[PDB]
Amino acid sequence: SVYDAAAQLTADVKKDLRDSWKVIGSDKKGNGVALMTTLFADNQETIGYFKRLGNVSQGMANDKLRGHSITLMYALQNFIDQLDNPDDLVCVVEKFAVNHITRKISAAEFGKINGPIKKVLASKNFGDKYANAWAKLVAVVQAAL
Amino acid sequence: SVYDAAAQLTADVKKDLRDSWKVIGSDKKGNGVALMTTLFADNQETIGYFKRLGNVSQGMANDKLRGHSITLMYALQNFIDQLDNPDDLVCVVEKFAVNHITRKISAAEFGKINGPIKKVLASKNFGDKYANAWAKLVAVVQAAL
Ligand code: HEM
Numbered sequence: 001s002v003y004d005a006a007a008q009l010t011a012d013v014k015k016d017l018r019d020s021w022k023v024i025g026s027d028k029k030g031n032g033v034a035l036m037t038t039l040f041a042d043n044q045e046t047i048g049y050f051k052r053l054g055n056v057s058q059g060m061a062n063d064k065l066r067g068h069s070i071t072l073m074y075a076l077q078n079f080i081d082q083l084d085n086p087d088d089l090v091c092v093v094e095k096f097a098v099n100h101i102t103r104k105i106s107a108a109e110f111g112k113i114n115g116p117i118k119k120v121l122a123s124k125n126f127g128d129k130y131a132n133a134w135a136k137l138v139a140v141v142q143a144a145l
Numbered sequence: 146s147v148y149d150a151a152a153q154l155t156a157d158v159k160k161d162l163r164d165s166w167k168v169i170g171s172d173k174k175g176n177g178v179a180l181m182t183t184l185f186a187d188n189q190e191t192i193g194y195f196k197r198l199g200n201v202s203q204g205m206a207n208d209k210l211r212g213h214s215i216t217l218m219y220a221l222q223n224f225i226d227q228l229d230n231p232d233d234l235v236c237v238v239e240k241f242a243v244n245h246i247t248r249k250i251s252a253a254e255f256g257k258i259n260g261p262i263k264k265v266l267a268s269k270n271f272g273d274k275y276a277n278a279w280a281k282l283v284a285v286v287q288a289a290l
């Protein structure tokens with residue numbers, strides 16, 4: 001259950017998620033676009049899903065991609081703010097899960113985001129521990145897909 | 146143009162939007178659900194659009210409505226954060242405009258949100274000036290619909 005998965009976020013995982021978010025979340029435009037262009041660079045098979053955004057190679061210059069990337073960073077901002085209350089975390093997670101289910105995105109495919117997160121965090125000197133905490137949050141979303 | 150409308154947000158309007166957001170945005174769950182239940186109470190003709198959320202009369206207890214309301218408050222959080230840069234404000238606005246165009250929501254209907262905003266702001270002792278500033282931001286989104 002998304003509920004059980006959500007419950008797996010211990011005080012230590014929450015602390016790591018918050019501390020790292022202080023840095024990655026402080027530049028939603030830059031880090032959001034980085035997460036996206038890295039997703040496309042390492043998983044080219046996912047590009048076809050983002051047909052609405054036009055030419056994603058354009059990176060930052062592509063307004064649709066930029067508008068999408070900033071908005072995504074707020075979904076994460078939403079999750080981070082709901083950590084202390086699993087009931088609210090679960091409903092926001094389920095709301096976004098529906099956005100992906102309607103696009104035929106499976107739990108396995110959604111998990112491809114773990115690669116980019118590991119790199120973005122790395123470029124900010126946050127090691128494996130942080131990458132692992134972020135995988136646990138992504139796992140709560142996967143429990144809903 | 147959404148661009149022109151966005152340009153209409155002067156230093157004074159931005160200040161009022163930020164100051165009032167300090168209070169309304171500090172309780173996204175509560176104020177978000179208030180904006181929604183007030184929208185449904187004063188504009189019953191809009192309820193049919195929210196079929197996915199189930200029984201909206203359930204208010205806070207309805208997780209789908211709660212998940213939707215918190216997420217909406219982040220869209221506004223997104224707009225407020227992009228005020229200083231019209232280029233980023235325009236792309237996030239256009240991203241959300243598409244979410245409404247696909248649901249057949251016209252600029253006039255989207256404007257119905259001005260009523261609820263005026264009330265939510267009022268219950269926090271923010272008068273007409275603030276309600277007017279918020280109408281100008283809602284106007285930027287309307288320029289895109
Ligand atoms: C940290 C992880 C992720 C978050 C928080 C996230 C967040 C979002 C958000 C907020 C939207 C917009 C929803 C809407 O307005 O309809 C969205 C759409 C979408 N996401 Fe994700 N997403 C993530 C990872 C992924 C992954 C791994 C895939 C790739 C297989 C994916 C595929 C999609 C698709 C296809 C769309 C539609 C794009 C469009 O046409 O606008 N997402 N996502």
Ligand code: HEM
Nearest residue numbers: 099191194195197216217220221244248250254255257258
């Ligand atoms: C302050 C104003 C508003 C904001 C920022 C806003 C924001 C949002 C957001 C973020 C979504 C979710 C997008 C998605 O992932 O599908 C959404 C969906 C939607 N909005 Fe709005 N909205 C606003 C006002 C309105 C108004 C006035 C109407 C009513 C006529 C409306 C109708 C809809 C509909 C029909 C949906 C789909 C609900 C669902 O099936 O989940 N919105 N809105």
